[PDB]
Design a protein around this nucleic acid. Structure first.
Ligand SMILES: Nc1ncnc2c1ncn2[C@@H]1O[C@H](COP(=O)(O)OP(=O)(O)OP(O)(O)=S)[C@@H](O)[C@H]1O
Ligand SMILES: Nc1ncnc2c1ncn2[C@@H]1O[C@H](COP(=O)(O)OP(=O)(O)OP(O)(O)=S)[C@@H](O)[C@H]1O
Ligand SMILES: Nc1ncnc2c1ncn2[C@@H]1O[C@H](COP(=O)(O)OP(=O)(O)OP(O)(O)=S)[C@@H](O)[C@H]1O
Ligand SMILES: Nc1ncnc2c1ncn2[C@@H]1O[C@H](COP(=O)(O)OP(=O)(O)OP(O)(O)=S)[C@@H](O)[C@H]1O
Ligand SMILES: Nc1ncnc2c1ncn2[C@@H]1O[C@H](COP(=O)(O)OP(=O)(O)O)[C@@H](O)[C@H]1O
Ligand SMILES: [Mg+2]
Ligand SMILES: [Mg+2]
Ligand SMILES: [Mg+2]
Ligand SMILES: [Mg+2]
Lengths: 435, 327, 330, 317, 353
DNA sequence: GATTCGTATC
DNA sequence: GCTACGGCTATACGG
DNA sequence: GATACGAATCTTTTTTTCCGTATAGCCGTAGC
């Protein structure tokens, strides 16, 4: 078969996972098999090929035949289309029959093949069906494990209606905050496989192919290809597939693995401090725009640059550089989201931070923009102002525009009503102003 | 019926021999038809160059009287989304040609307005049914076409119409309409054409309407300038001389008098002064940089409106300040 | 009865003044039947809408107008679907049979007219979906595009449409039309008036007619039987009085930032429009003989920049203060 | 009237006729002779032989079983979540008696245009049925295929075709068709091709049809030099009076639209060498302002002349 | 009610702050049949809306102040319930399309076109009438129309001028396009002088006894109001109730909290000029923007507070005003205001250092 | 990509 | 022989 | 014992097409 299917781990010691991560998964899973467990769903999130299900299966192999009140998992198959069932009801009938997999029929239900969540209605049905499992009144329920692979959704659906699920396939955009911040849900984020474990497993696979490796005069150059694959990728499946493709080859075809997408804070750090791989800013910016145009085009990135450019040296650079950066960002904001705007703003920020960059600079920590907090406080201000307006319409027949409200009605009007009451709203609209 | 038509539609070419200006493209497509092997074509050029007139005449030459059932013409006036490509174009290409003229022709006019999903889906319809159907893509902007679609199409560029072709078509129009045109009027029409036959025909129709008697009267340059509302070649030179030589009061008076003489706008004067200053032997390399940059901002501000007198004074001051560098 | 701008709207093509290069061409199409696709562009209030409304009437008559005319403006949706369905189906429609009265009184051309007024507000895709609609059905349907900015019309559509530029209506070509309206309404004005009205209304007859109507509504309210003077016209047009402008230029000549800032602060309270005081300063500074070539060259660009910033919808106080400070340091 | 265009008439039918990317074609030949084809993703610029390689590999791997062992789906066919869940699932579930080491092949041409839900269902499709059928994705930009799908595949990147492979294929076609040529004409055809076989064949066909003899004059009078190479020459000029001359003569009077020149200038500047980053970002800013002015309605020659003047001003300073 | 609405002139003869304007309004209302479309422009709080209502009361008689709120519902291209309050009277309508955002085009294209299409025939009356024949629509804040609602009005108020008339209230009529201003009669409303504001406040403190110690305290409020009658009448009530209805010469003038915060920001900018100070200024700007205060006013007050600093030379102020103009133009042609509001501050501190 | 805390190993 | 109503199916619409 | 390595944290508020469900119209069949 394929080397990632024939050289699959047989026990937990052969799984490419960190020791601490394995310990936290093991203890959490063991706790979820108790009669009345505090955690009902275990949400495993991370990149592709991180042994997320490759650890769940081999842990179930030793966990399920320990608590079965006298051996494997029950995985949801989304592609199953039965005769008399709506497509959106396929997961409901799976969760309604999976809840019977309890004592004397115990089985860890694993949901790796998620239902179609790019369609809004079935995504909402999935969310409310998970909420109906977290808030279930059943005295005993089987352990539920949901594996979600964090992958960036590529540029498609040219409509401007791109939602979060249209940008990144992550647990945040599939689940809601009620599920994600539930007392009975445990989240264990997974990290890409480190170079040491990848090297060890690719060397075990090589000593299991030593005969064929030596016959094709490829056994002394195995160290360099394992090192290159370990340094280039963090995907175990992609690493083994590339190793198999290189071994079964008989030529000088170059080693090429899959491509990974950077993070939002990773891209911010690349724009600010530069990349260690290349000292050419033009090449780095061009590759960042080529591979990650879905993130460099969103306005929140240009906002994050303005929010985090002060972390270069904890805020101890020249004011002229900061003025140039913010002026360039303001000028880019007037280009109506053209491709030439981001490619100029990021280039100017990188050029500004390159010249002032000196050795020994103790940089700061970047953060996400607070624009959303301001936008929600604006909506709260709107709600309170409309409450002021409608409560000030029948008691005292008067119409006033919201622009006049945000200037003189919210400081003066409470200062009159509360002063008339110190002897009908009486508080400042939108809360007090600070600093 | 055809005499109650606008001149831009009445004088549409019906055969490939009536398409002027584009000699290399026509002498290639005619041999392509003569050999009988027509590849997938791409016609590119400015508006009013003769791309649609070429492709319709070519299809008429190939198909004769069977143009109705053998040619599918889809343009921007019809929906051409992913479903349209996957159904209408695909069933037109897949079905047989009733053994009429060998291969089918699909003309995609104004394909630059087509969405990228449709242009990407059309790539495996162009190269799969190429034995029975051929695609012709007409576009004015090549940046809106996917690179693969450009790759699977033979690109023919329609150049702006040369002066000789404009003169040859004007002669036919004058013969048909029994009109007389002075050589200076023809020169004015060709310089204002900017390589467009539609503009030539539209201006000629208005010039014929302007004449009190369509016959026994010749359309002079004055008639053309009055009809199209363009400054005369002397007014532009007078304004430029007043700006470059006279003081700030006399130049301001001369510009306003020239503009109020015939209700001349500022944008055409700006373009004329730009064209006249283009062939000027500047010797500082900053006079040109300042002139072009200031006149472009004035031209952009005029496009959004504003105070006209302030813009005219801005033009005068920009020219005067840019020519301060030269001396 | 009605506002004078609507009462004196041109009913026929002979009432459209100062635009003969286009009306002469349009009148010839009454005898012929070769009306082309038309693009009416020019300054606001020049008579583009009135000309097409008069041409439509003179071509069809009030009875055939309802069947042979489709008018779409910015007051209705003109998206890609509207252009590809409603306009295309109206162009594909068959020319209705003229009545015997219509054929015996009106020319009744064998085509209909689609009038797309305020075409500058249409998107580039709705305009792209119109090119083959006008070309294919040109023998049965004609198109009239009316706009103020010809740059907002795409080049493919502008090539297919005959361009008719409507000239700005100044005191040299609209004085007879204004005098006619003054005479029919029995408006008494001093000599020089009805020219100051057309000078204040830069290339706009609608604003001048409204200004004259407003002057008359005060003249017959005063009830003294006296002629309207240019001072009242300037007062009710928003023109800054010359004493205030002289004070502005005297404060500018001193060059002290604080006094100019205080004067601008007390001037913005009077409610004067920035585009008017900037325009008046332009006339004061450009035509004056006490300034050198360099000063005029610099201030021309300063006024151009100020006007361009003001046209974008910016704060008048900041722009006016910056302009006066820049002139004070020239 | 029944003669096929030279692009389709001389489309390779075996892997040995595919010039360029010698190592990758050799590896495809090893896959064809052995049989154990892995899941693969083929990416590259259009017209370098990505599709004609996958199809030839499927032919040489199946032969008489190609009719029932290959399911070819592309952008012209509907490839929603339902087709993947029904048609692809039934094709994968189908049991066909193929020789040893031979597997069914699902050729998903233009996989970069597939929706996200179909790509996510393809994960389960390849996971359940990897022992019987193998998937061969062919695309132009490999990042459009989701990372979970790329993890199960062996990425094969096709590079640009050099000037020697193009000449070899052109000479084979010339010998087959017996056309008259000279060396400079073929050099001009390769130069205008810019690493494109399909465009080189189309240009050679057009030149032969138009004139018959493939020389530089007849090639260049029907085919045009690549306008990115003229935009690069205009933007890299030393003094303004010849950059304006280039923009006028080779771009404006030739018929290229102003928006096309502006869009090409941006891509040229992004890849321009020997220019400082501070210069490059200012050039990008000026090109973006010019692009805004063109998009807002002012598509005139003066706006391009001003952009070149600003670029020269920033260059000299 | 508040003293701003209680002591509001409800007739054209009760206006007492501009007399050359009241006479022009009387001239307009003498023959209301041929009343053109009116555009009242001037500083905020001068009494433009009060004068519009007084003119409507002179035209259609009393009862135009009998306002009721009729909640409307609109649907845009993608189905979404967008709500607009319509304050209506038996003779006039008041709409604020800016309250619904960028989608005011649909409000102008549906509500205004439906109102302008109804002839208001009533009982017979097919010939003409001074009242109840044509209708008055008041568009408050005409400046915030997004250049597309102003395009749908050009033909709406021109073709249907017989059955509808428009009186739009606005300040600083720069963002109003030229075709809209061409169809309308421009009415300038100057701000009251300090003497007139003092007289109005004297009438208010005469009708309601606040025990004025000196007439100077009313003048100080007028000078602090900067021409705003509503603000002056609000501070009068504030210093009245906050001093147990007894105004003293030592009574502090109460100013809006955001103005005090802008002054504190100005002093911080003058004192500290560094990157961390710029980050603190960004926090202050974000807090100010969280209270739905428009960004153009933030920039205007920040600039005119920085120009009041006595420790700044003329070269610094001439650069501050230039940066203010540049960033105001950038803010007008922009999407997010924080970039420009931070760039202006950064350039100001980079110039003052 | 940066900082900070915590291991594992040579 | 005829009719009404439930089940099957094609189509416009929501998000 | 020095150090490389690794994990945690640094995050969220007009237009087109597609996927599954809703719904009314037409045919089949029980029956009175
Ligand atoms: N030593 C190893 N450790 C982990 N996985 C291994 C190992 N050797 C082979 N594999 C295979 O690598 C694959 C890893 O699968 P997982 O990472 O558990 O799935 P995943 O994380 O959901 O990836 P995606 O998102 O489905 S592509 C499985 O097919 C394993 O059989
Ligand atoms: N070479 C030509 N010879 C004669 N008339 C021409 C020529 N080119 C254009 N015309 C005239 O111009 C009209 C419009 O040209 P078309 O070919 O229909 O459009 P086009 O030239 O393809 O430009 P676009 O891209 O469609 S706007 C034709 O109907 C002819 O009347
Ligand atoms: N040449 C003219 N002769 C007589 N009246 C004119 C002339 N030009 C304009 N007017 C008057 O100007 C007023 C408005 O004219 P319209 O043509 O409707 O406006 P416009 O030219 O379309 O400007 P818009 O709508 O802003 S593009 C009417 O009262 C006309 O009578
Ligand atoms: N290496 C090659 N040798 C010979 N002909 C080639 C080669 N590469 C491409 N061609 C020709 O290119 C044409 C079609 O090539 P394709 O493989 O379909 O293009 P492609 O590389 O798949 O690019 P896309 O993305 O599918 S448009 C045929 O005429 C082939 O003969
Ligand atoms: N002539 C006047 N006499 C007394 N009070 C006035 C006068 N004009 C305006 N006001 C007061 O000013 C307050 C607000 O005026 P407003 O109509 O909001 O002005 P604007 O329309 O310019 O915003 C009103 O409450 C009113 O009491
Ligand atoms: Mg897995
Ligand atoms: Mg065409
Ligand atoms: Mg009009
Ligand atoms: Mg292909």
């Amino acid at each position: 078969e394929q080397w990632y299917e024939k050289f699959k781990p047989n026990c937990l010691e052969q799984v490419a996972i960190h020791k601490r991560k394995l310990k936290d998964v093991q203890e959490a899973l063991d706790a979820m098999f108790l009669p009345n467990a505090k955690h009902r769903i275990l949400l495993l999130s991370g990149p592709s090929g991180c042994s997320k299900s490759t650890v769940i299966k081999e842990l179930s192999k030793i966990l399920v035949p320990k608590y079965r009140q006298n051996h494997k998992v029950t995985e949801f198959r989304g592609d199953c289309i039965v005769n008399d069932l709506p497509q959106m009801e396929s997961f409901s009938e799976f969760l309604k029959g999976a809840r019977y997999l309890v004592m004397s029929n115990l089985s860890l239900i694993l949901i790796e093949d998620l239902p179609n969540v790019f369609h809004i209605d079935t995504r909402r049905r999935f969310q409310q069906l998970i909420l109906q499992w977290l808030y279930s009144s059943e005295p005993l329920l089987p352990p539920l494990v949901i594996c979600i692979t964090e992958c960036e959704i590529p540029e498609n659906d040219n409509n401007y209606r791109k939602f979060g699920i249209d940008y990144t396939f992550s647990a945040e955009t599939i689940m809601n905050k009620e599920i994600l911040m539930h007392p009975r849900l445990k989240r264990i984020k997974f990290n890409p496989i480190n170079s040491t474990l990848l090297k060890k497993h690719l060397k075990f696979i090589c000593v299991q192919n030593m005969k064929m490796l030596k016959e094709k005069n490829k056994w002394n150059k195995r160290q360099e290809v394992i090192d290159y694959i370990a340094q280039e990728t963090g995907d175990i499946r992609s690493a083994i597939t590339t190793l198999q493709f290189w071994a079964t080859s008989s030529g000088s075809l170059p080693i090429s693995t899959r491509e990974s997408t950077i993070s939002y804070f990773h891209a911010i750090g690349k724009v600010i401090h530069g990349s260690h791989s290349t000292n050419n800013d033009n090449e780095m910016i061009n590759n960042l725009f080529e591979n990650s145009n879905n993130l460099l085009s969103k306005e929140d990135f240009k906002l994050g640059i303005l929010e985090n450019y002060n972390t270069f040296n904890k805020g101890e650079f020249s004011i002229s550089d900061a003025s140039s950066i913010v002026d360039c960002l303001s000028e880019c904001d007037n280009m109506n989201g053209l491709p030439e705007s981001n490619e100029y703003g990021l280039r100017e920020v990188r050029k500004t931070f390159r010249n002032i960059s000196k050795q020994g600079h103790n940089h700061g920590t970047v953060y996400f923009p607070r624009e959303w907090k301001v936008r929600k406080l604006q909506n709260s201000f709107k709600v309170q102002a409309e409450d002021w307006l409608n409560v000030s319409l029948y008691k005292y027949n008067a119409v006033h525009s919201f622009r006049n409200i945000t200037l003189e009605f919210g400081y003066y009007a409470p200062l009159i009503r509360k002063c008339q009451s110190y002897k009908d709203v009486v508080d400042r609209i939108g809360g007090p102003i600070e600093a | 019926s055809k005499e109650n038509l606008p001149w831009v539609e009445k004088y549409r070419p019906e055969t490939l021999d009536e398409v002027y200006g584009q000699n290399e493209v026509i002498t290639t497509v005619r041999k392509f038809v003569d050999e009988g092997k027509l590849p997938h074509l791409l016609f590119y050029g400015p508006p009013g160059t003769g791309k649609t007139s070429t492709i319709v005449a070519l299809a008429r030459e190939i198909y004769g009287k069977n143009y109705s059932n053998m040619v599918l013409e889809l343009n921007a006036s019809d929906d051409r989304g992913i479903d349209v490509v996957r159904n209408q174009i695909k069933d037109f290409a897949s079905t047989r040609q009733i053994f009429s003229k060998g291969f089918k022709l699909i003309i995609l006019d104004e394909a630059d307005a087509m969405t990228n999903a449709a242009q990407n889906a059309l790539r495996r319809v162009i190269e799969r049914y190429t034995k029975n159907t051929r695609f012709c893509v007409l576009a004015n902007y090549a940046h809106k076409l996917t690179p693969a679609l450009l790759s699977r199409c033979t690109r023919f560029r329609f150049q702006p119409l040369p002066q000789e072709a404009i003169e040859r078509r004007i002669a036919n129009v004058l013969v048909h309409e029994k009109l007389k045109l002075s050589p200076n009027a023809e020169k004015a029409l060709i310089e204002l054409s900017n390589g467009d036959m539609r503009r030539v025909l539209n201006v000629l129709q208005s010039c014929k309407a302007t004449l009190d008697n369509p016959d026994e009267d010749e359309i002079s340059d004055d008639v053309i300038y009055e009809c199209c509302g363009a400054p005369r070649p002397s007014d532009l030179k007078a304004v430029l001389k007043s700006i470059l030589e006279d003081d700030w009061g006399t130049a301001h008076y001369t510009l306003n008098k020239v503009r109020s003489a015939k209700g001349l706008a500022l944008i055409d004067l700006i373009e004329g002064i730009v064209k006249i200053l283009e062939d000027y032997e500047l010797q500082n390399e900053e006079t040109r940089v300042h002139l072009l940059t200031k006149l472009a901002d004035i031209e952009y501000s005029i496009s959004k409106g504003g105070n006209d007198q302030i813009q005219g004074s801005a033009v005068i001051g920009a020219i005067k300040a840019s020519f301060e560098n030269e001396t | 009865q009605q506002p004078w701008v609507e009462k004196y709207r041109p009913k026929n093509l002979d009432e459209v003044t100062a635009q003969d290069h286009a009306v002469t061409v349009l009148k010839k199409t009454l005898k012929s039947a070769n009306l082309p696709h038309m693009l009416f562009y020019g300054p606001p209030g020049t008579g583009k809408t009135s000309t097409i409304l008069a041409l439509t009437k003179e071509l069809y008559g009030p009875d055939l107008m309802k069947s042979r005319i489709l008018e779409l403006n910015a007051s209705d949706e003109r998206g890609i679907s509207i252009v590809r369905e409603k306009v295309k189906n109206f162009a594909r429609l068959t020319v209705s049979k003229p009545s015997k009265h219509d054929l015996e009184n009106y020319p009744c051309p064998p085509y209909k007219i689609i009038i797309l007024d305020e075409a500058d507000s249409m998107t580039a895709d709705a305009q792209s979906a119109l090119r083959r609609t006008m070309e294919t059905y040109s023998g049965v349907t004609r198109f009239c595009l009316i706009c103020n900015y010809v740059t907002r019309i795409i080049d493919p559509l502008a090539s297919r449409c005959s361009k008719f530029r409507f000239k700005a209506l100044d005191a040299s070509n609209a004085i007879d039309r204004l005098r006619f309206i003054s005479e029919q309404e029995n408006v008494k004005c001093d000599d020089g008036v009805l020219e100051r009205i057309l000078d204040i209304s830069a290339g706009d007859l609608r604003r001048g007619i409204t200004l004259l109507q407003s002057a008359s509504k005060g003249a017959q309210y005063l009830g003294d039987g006296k002629n309207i003077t240019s001072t009242q016209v300037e007062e009710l047009a928003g023109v800054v009085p010359h004493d205030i402008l002289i004070e502005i230029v005297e404060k500018v000549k001193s060059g002290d930032f604080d006094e100019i800032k205080k004067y601008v602060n007390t001037f913005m309270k009077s409610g004067w429009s920035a585009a008017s005081v900037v325009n008046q300063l332009h006339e004061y500074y450009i035509t004056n003989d006490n300034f050198d070539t360099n000063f005029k060259n610099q201030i021309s660009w300063l006024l151009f920049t100020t006007d361009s910033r003001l046209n974008n919808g910016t704060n008048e106080h900041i722009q006016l203060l910056n302009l006066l400070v820049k002139i004070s340091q020239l | 009237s029944l003669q096929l265009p030279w692009v389709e008439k001389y489309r390779p039918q075996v892997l040995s006729d595919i010039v360029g990317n010698k190592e990758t074609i050799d590896r495809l030949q090893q896959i064809a002779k052995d049989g154990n084809m892995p899941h693969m993703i083929i990416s590259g610029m259009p017209g370098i032989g990505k599709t004609t390689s996958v199809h030839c590999l499927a032919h040489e791997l199946l032969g008489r079983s190609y009719a029932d062992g290959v399911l070819e789906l592309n952008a012209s066919d509907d490839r929603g979540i339902d087709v993947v869940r029904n048609q692809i699932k039934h094709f994968a579930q189908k049991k066909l008696h193929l020789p040893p080491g031979k597997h069914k092949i699902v050729i998903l041409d233009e996989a970069d245009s597939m929706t996200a839900g179909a790509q996510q269902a393809l994960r389960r499709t390849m996971e359940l049925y990897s022992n019987s059928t193998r998937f061969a994705f062919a695309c132009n930009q490999s990042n459009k295929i989701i990372e979970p799908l790329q993890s199960r595949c062996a990425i094969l990147r096709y590079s640009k075709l050099s000037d020697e492979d193009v000449l070899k294929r052109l000479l084979q076609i010339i010998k087959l068709e017996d056309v008259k040529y000279t060396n400079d004409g073929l050099e001009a055809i390769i130069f205008t091709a810019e690493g494109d076989m399909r465009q080189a064949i189309n240009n050679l066909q057009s030149t032969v049809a138009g004139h018959g003899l493939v020389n530089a004059d007849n090639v260049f009078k029907i085919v045009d030099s690549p306008h990115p190479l003229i935009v690069k020459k205009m933007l890299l000029a030393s003094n303004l009076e010849d950059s304006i001359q280039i923009l006028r003569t080779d771009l404006w009077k030739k018929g290229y639209s102003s928006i096309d020149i502006v869009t090409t200038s941006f891509r040229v500047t992004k890849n321009l060498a020997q220019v400082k980053e501070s210069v490059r970002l200012e050039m990008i800013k000026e090109i973006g302002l010019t692009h805004m002015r063109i998009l807002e309605g002012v598509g005139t020659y003066l706006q391009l002349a001003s952009m070149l003047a600003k670029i020269h001003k920033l260059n000299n300073k | 009610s508040l003293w701003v609405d209680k002591y509001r002139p409800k007739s054209l003869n009760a206006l007492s702050h501009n007399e050359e304007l009241t006479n022009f309004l009387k001239s307009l209302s003498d023959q209301p049949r041929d009343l053109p479309h009116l555009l009242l422009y001037g500083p905020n709080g001068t009494g433009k809306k009060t004068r519009c209502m007084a003119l409507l009361e002179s035209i259609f008689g009393p009862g135009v102040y009998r306002l009721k709120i009729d909640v409307r519902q609109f649907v845009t291209a993608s189905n979404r319930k967008l709500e607009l309050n319509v304050v209506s009277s038996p003779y006039h309508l008041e709409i604020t399309p800016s309250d619904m955002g960028n989608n005011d085009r649909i409000v102008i294209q549906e509500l205004l076109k439906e109102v302008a299409q109804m002839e208001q025939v009533d009982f017979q009356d097919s010939k003409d009438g001074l009242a109840h024949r044509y209708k008055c629509v008041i568009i408050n804040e005409a400046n915030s129309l997004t250049k597309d609602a102003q395009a749908a009005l050009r033909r709406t108020m021109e073709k249907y001028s017989k059955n509808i008339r428009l009186i739009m209230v606005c300040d600083s009529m720069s963002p109003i396009i030229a075709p809209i201003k061409s169809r309308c009669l421009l009415i300038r409303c100057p701000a009251p002088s300090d003497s007139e504001i003092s007289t109005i406040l004297s009438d208010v403190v005469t009708n309601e006894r606040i025990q004025l110690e000196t007439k100077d305290i009313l003048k100080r409020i007028a000078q602090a109001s900067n021409g705003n009658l509503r603000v002056s009448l609000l501070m009068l009530e504030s210093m009245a109730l906050n001093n147990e209805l007894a105004l003293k010469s030592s009574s502090p003038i109460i100013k809006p909290d955001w103005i005090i915060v802008i002054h504190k920001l100005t002093r911080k900018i003058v004192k500290e000029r560094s990157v961390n100070s710029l980050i603190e200024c960004r926090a202050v700007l974000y807090d100010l923007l969280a209270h739905c205060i428009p960004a153009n006013i933030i920039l205007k007050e920040l600039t005119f507070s920085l120009l009041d600093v006595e420790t700044l030379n003329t070269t610094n102020k001439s650069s501050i005003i230039e940066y203010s103009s540049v960033f105001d133009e950038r803010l007008s042609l922009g999407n997010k205001a924080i970039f420009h509001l931070e760039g202006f501050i950064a350039k100001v501190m980079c110039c003052l250092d």
